[PDB]
């Protein structure tokens, strides 16, 4: 109702850019080490976007050491600092779960050129 909508919206920051699915993106994450905190950069490709209010989370996949690791980043969580788009893609598909099997050239995507 109104109360829950107000509670959800009062904790929203208008800083996340609008990135299409399958678009390469970098994420800055705060990580706690020892008694301090530091920044970590994670580059990947957005596969699925599920923007349920403040519960908005997007899955970002990366290839490291020859293995695929996918992590879900919360759109508005304090843990996520900033989102930057480096390489722009274009796929006519909301979800990119199909590429888990593709590799090399097949996994690559074409430039948007919008």
């Amino acid at each position: 109702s109104n109360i829950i909508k107000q509670l959800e919206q009062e904790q929203m920051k208008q800083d996340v850019p609008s990135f299409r699915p399958g678009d390469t993106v970098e994420v800055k994450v705060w990580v706690v080490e020892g008694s301090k905190k530091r920044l970590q950069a994670f580059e990947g490709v957005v596969i699925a976007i599920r923007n349920r209010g403040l519960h908005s989370a997007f899955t970002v996949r990366k290839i490291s050491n020859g293995e695929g690791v996918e992590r879900v980043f919360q759109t508005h969580s304090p843990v996520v600092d900033s989102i930057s788009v480096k390489r722009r893609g274009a796929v006519r598909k909301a979800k990119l779960y199909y590429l888990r099997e593709r590799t090399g050239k097949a996994a690559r995507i074409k430039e948007r050129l919008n």
Partner: protein, 122 residues
């Protein structure tokens, strides 16, 4: 999460390629084992020469889980498959000095202080 009789990917230079689970420890009448739990696995394939021989039975620990684990902030770490590294009851220090793929931040256990150094890719 890992269940009984599940294949685990090998993330060490011990030469192992395919390892099968036989028994699950870490709790009486336990049905599943997490990433930070000790499991019992065997070996299916071994290199022609090395310290690991076919048929050996020894402990191991999962470094990566297909299902993944959650985070206090709601984040979830999911991997393309299950990866496990063999461990020994005595001389816990695994032979492998190199680990395939990244690792999570839950390896801060008392006996896992020597593995965080490895796996440079996070």
């Amino acid at each position: 999460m890992i269940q009984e009789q599940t294949m685990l990917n090998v993330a060490d230079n011990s030469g192992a390629r395919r390892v099968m689970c036989i028994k699950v420890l870490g709790g009486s009448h336990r049905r599943y084992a997490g990433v930070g739990d000790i499991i019992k696995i065997t070996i299916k394939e071994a290199i022609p020469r090395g310290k690991v021989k076919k048929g050996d039975v020894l402990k191991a620990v999962v470094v990566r889980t297909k299902k993944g684990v959650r985070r206090p902030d709601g984040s979830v770490i999911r991997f393309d498959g299950n990866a496990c590294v063999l461990l020994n009851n005595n001389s816990e220090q695994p032979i492998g000095t190199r680990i395939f793929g990244p690792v999570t931040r839950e390896l801060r256990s008392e006996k896992f202080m020597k593995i965080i150094s490895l796996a440079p890719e996070v």
